[PDB]
Structure 1
Amino acid sequence: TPAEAALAAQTALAADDSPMGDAARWAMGLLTSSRPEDVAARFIPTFNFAETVREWRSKGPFTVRAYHPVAHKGWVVLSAPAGVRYILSLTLDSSGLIRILTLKPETVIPDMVTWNDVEETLHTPGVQHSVYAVRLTPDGHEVLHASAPERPMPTGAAYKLYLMRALVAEIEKGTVGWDEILTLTPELRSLPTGDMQDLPDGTRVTVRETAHKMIALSDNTGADLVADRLGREVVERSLAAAGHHDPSLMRPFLTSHEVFELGWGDPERRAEWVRQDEAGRRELLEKMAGVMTVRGSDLGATVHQLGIDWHMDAFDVVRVLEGLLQDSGRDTSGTVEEILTAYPGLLIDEERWRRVYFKAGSSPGVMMFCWLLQDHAGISYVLVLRQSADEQRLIGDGLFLRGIGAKIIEAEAKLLSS
């Protein structure tokens, strides 16, 4: 019941002995209590805020109604006076320092009974969306639901699933090794999502740990370190085998650093990209090589419509995940499996699901989430959710699309395995 649920969340917040626990409690403290050095110590070292906090506080008093810790990400649902609800969102770095802290109007998602509930909840005028849900079988895929799976859409960090398949293909060939050392240079540093950019120049990291962060933290710097080591040609030549319908859509296969620098840097360089063919684009990227000028404050305008993102259809996503499941099964060391299952993006019912793979991607005007879920008998399902728009405010921070995923998965007995 509502009272039971709120009490359960309050108690769990209090009890949560973890990085998210400590951070969520401290943040709630900012809100419910009556010191800029204590603040500096709780946030990332590269992290106005007192003004922000005064405004948050003005909306209370707050009551905790739900608490959803999920590794380095957490959400707390709050009620304020007169039944108005908000969500406090936390994203942490690898040692539990706060990277992102927001307090925003509540994201409302109903419990789902039918796939039409999903569609009618999700639809937003001005936003293109797509929902694709399948059951994998020896004899092909059973379609459970489909809206526009055939439309190629931008998918942000979903591209890292192809980068991982490319990496595994080369490990199998023996051209790269899991314990091989990669080195962070100023030129290889990208923007968040991720934590590896916060490492010193010259930092030495294994391929294994870099690939782990590339997937589990969607580490952009991690991804770029891997893409650099493999080479753009090796990444691109792999796309056909890894499951992509039209590899020319992702050529040249961009790094995250390239998407950031091209998308929100020099407008003229960006016009030249639009004008150019594949040769001219490769030449433009080569000249753009160097230390980033673009910062996170620069982002906002949409550029995916210019090809400055990573485009694939829903079928492409199913194929790459199924390919990863096969790749993992071949890897007797369990290295691939550990990387893929580190971060499921949600609290999972582990008694139901033996393995869950997950990947999110986002850019201005772009949001996507995908899961592969396999039960203890061996039956696999894949869920692919995508949104694109010409205005970022139509999409928002992604809690909506992720929460729709969560509700589908919560109702798996109705929607996936009925």
Structure 2
Amino acid sequence: SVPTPAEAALAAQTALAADDSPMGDAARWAMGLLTRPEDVAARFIPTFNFAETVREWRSKGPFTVRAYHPVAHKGWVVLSAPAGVRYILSLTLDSSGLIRILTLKPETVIPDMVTWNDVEETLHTPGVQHSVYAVRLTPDGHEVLHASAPERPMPTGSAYKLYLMRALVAEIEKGTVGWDEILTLTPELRSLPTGDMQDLPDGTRVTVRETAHKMIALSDNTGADLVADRLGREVVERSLAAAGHHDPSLMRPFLTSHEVFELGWGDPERRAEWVRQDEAGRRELLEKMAGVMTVRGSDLGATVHQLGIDWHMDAFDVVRVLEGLLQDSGRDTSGTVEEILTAYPGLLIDEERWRRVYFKAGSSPGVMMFCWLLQDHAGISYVLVLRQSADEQRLIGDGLFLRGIGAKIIEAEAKLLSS
């Protein structure tokens, strides 16, 4: 008794109208633009041409809402326009519901998946290296459900925050840091979005717990940098092998988000020097680069992951860090780890099927990855790792494609994961 096209669209239209959440508020406002600089300023982040963008968007309608997919601070609305042309309106919000990102783009098309070959043939894009790895975790080891290039080390962007989380948990267990310990935002520690903590004023005091929460749930770069500063680079590097990484040297020096941004898209000479240097020279360069960021979001574009300016790991490294975090969570009887890991599942999840879902995304120019750990109410866990890398960012896009492939795999779990 699957809903028919007409039923599906009506359900989405009503859900959008009824949604009494920050995403509902923002999506309805955005849809209103489609169907006043002072009111725009009040709806966007404080540090937010737009009237012209809205004019161009409006010229593509009239629009009909066909699907509505809110997920905490992120949301997508599928729109049909004249002649059956479809678009997706994407929203990303800050912590109080102000709009950070609002885009209207051609629809991303992902079929319902019947077989793993459907996944591979949908995903494959000339010029893009990709990898799909799916396993069932058991007492007796991992059962491989599907694998394409899991052994290939690839850049993974904010997947690295999973390793930072395991390092943090290890220090909590050793008693060198506490969940309620205070970290302090300084001008030097501020990074770029993703995240919201960069929007806090200088001197803002925040607990380790709340910083780690934002580091994971919002992929907060500033949160991650505060944690990495508190632990120290050497402590994080020493934690990598035990945390699950097969070859820690691939991620040494272990970069902060601030360092990736500043090195990757700042001074071209400094970046060339990085390429020429060994680990010692790279550490020395990073120390000299310490200070307040000069690079801004508009500077990003060119790919630099090929120069080692990212965080490289294989699919097996991602499975091990997620399984390790599952173990870390169970050991932490306070539920602090679990609360952090489950806050944002990246999708609308069937909670009657899945007791817990861990999720992490990562992206950089030419880099996209999504991973989930899903555990059912009987205690059976699955891990799904999706990765793309390319020399040209336009071959990958904003990540709705790879995320959507994950969504369809999870929707078809009875066929692809738990058959």
Q: TM-score range by the shorter chain?
A: over 0.9
C-alpha displacement at 1:378, in angstroms? 0.3
1:240-277 deviations in Å (ceiling 9; x for gaps): 10010110000000000000000000000000000000
Matches of 2:243 and 2:398, distance apart in 1: 30
C-alpha displacement at 1:157, in angstroms? 0.1
C-alpha displacement at 1:341, in angstroms? 0.2
1:338-363 deviations in Å (ceiling 9; x for gaps): 00000000000000000000000000
Matches of 2:175 and 2:217, distance apart in 1: 24
C-alpha displacement at 1:141, in angstroms? 0.1
1:278-326 deviations in Å (ceiling 9; x for gaps): 0000000000000000000000000000000000000000000000000
Matches of 2:121 and 2:321, distance apart in 1: 28
Matches of 2:246 and 2:181, distance apart in 1: 32
C-alpha displacement at 1:90, in angstroms? 0.1
Matches of 2:141 and 2:210, distance apart in 1: 34
Matches of 2:85 and 2:393, distance apart in 1: 24
C-alpha displacement at 1:386, in angstroms? 0.1
1:364-402 deviations in Å (ceiling 9; x for gaps): 000000000000000000000000000000000000000
Secondary structure of the structure 2 residue equivalent to 1:320: helix
C-alpha displacement at 1:116, in angstroms? 0.2
C-alpha displacement at 1:135, in angstroms? 0.2
C-alpha displacement at 1:195, in angstroms? 0.1
Secondary structure of the structure 2 residue equivalent to 1:118: helix
C-alpha displacement at 1:125, in angstroms? 0.2
Secondary structure of the structure 2 residue equivalent to 1:50: helix
C-alpha displacement at 1:45, in angstroms? 0.2
C-alpha displacement at 1:407, in angstroms? 0.2
Matches of 1:139 and 1:200, distance apart in 2: 50
Secondary structure of the structure 2 residue equivalent to 1:384: strand
Matches of 2:352 and 2:63, distance apart in 1: 34
Matches of 1:284 and 1:219, distance apart in 2: 25
Matches of 2:241 and 2:211, distance apart in 1: 24
C-alpha displacement at 1:175, in angstroms? 0.2
C-alpha displacement at 1:173, in angstroms? 0.3
Unaligned runs of 5+ in 2: none
C-alpha displacement at 1:239, in angstroms? 0.2
Secondary structure of the structure 2 residue equivalent to 1:74: strand
Matches of 1:328 and 1:64, distance apart in 2: 40
C-alpha displacement at 1:148, in angstroms? 0.1
C-alpha displacement at 1:406, in angstroms? 0.3
1:381 is aligned to: 382
Matches of 1:303 and 1:354, distance apart in 2: 38
Secondary structure of the structure 2 residue equivalent to 1:67: strand
Identity of matched residues, %: 100
C-alpha displacement at 1:65, in angstroms? 0.2
Question: What is the TM-score of this pair, normalised by structure 2?
Answer: 0.99
1:128-153 deviations in Å (ceiling 9; x for gaps): 00000000001110000000000000
Unaligned runs of 5+ in 1: none
C-alpha displacement at 1:159, in angstroms? 0.1
1:151-185 deviations in Å (ceiling 9; x for gaps): 00000000000000000000000000000000000
Matches of 1:406 and 1:181, distance apart in 2: 37
1:408 is aligned to: 409
C-alpha displacement at 1:66, in angstroms? 0.2
Matches of 2:235 and 2:375, distance apart in 1: 30
C-alpha displacement at 1:223, in angstroms? 0.1
Matches of 2:226 and 2:195, distance apart in 1: 12
1:67-120 deviations in Å (ceiling 9; x for gaps): 000000000000000000000000000000000000000000000000000000
Matches of 1:25 and 1:377, distance apart in 2: 39
Matches of 2:60 and 2:353, distance apart in 1: 40
Establish whether residue 96 from structure 1 lines up as the match of residue 97 from structure 2.
yes
Establish whether residue 267 from structure 1 lines up as the match of residue 268 from structure 2.
yes
1:184-233 deviations in Å (ceiling 9; x for gaps): 00000000000000000000000000000000000000000000000000
1:38 is aligned to: 39
Matches of 2:28 and 2:9, distance apart in 1: 16
Matches of 2:334 and 2:371, distance apart in 1: 25
Matches of 1:219 and 1:246, distance apart in 2: 26
Matches of 2:348 and 2:328, distance apart in 1: 25
Matches of 2:112 and 2:211, distance apart in 1: 37
C-alpha displacement at 1:237, in angstroms? 0.1
Secondary structure of the structure 2 residue equivalent to 1:253: coil
Matches of 2:351 and 2:57, distance apart in 1: 36
Matches of 2:144 and 2:249, distance apart in 1: 27
Secondary structure of the structure 1 residue equivalent to 2:255: coil
C-alpha displacement at 1:417, in angstroms? 0.2
C-alpha displacement at 1:21, in angstroms? 0.1
Secondary structure of the structure 2 residue equivalent to 1:104: strand
Secondary structure of the structure 2 residue equivalent to 1:413: helix
1:177 is aligned to: 178
Matches of 1:210 and 1:125, distance apart in 2: 39
Secondary structure of the structure 2 residue equivalent to 1:10: helix
Matches of 2:303 and 2:140, distance apart in 1: 40
C-alpha displacement at 1:63, in angstroms? 0.2
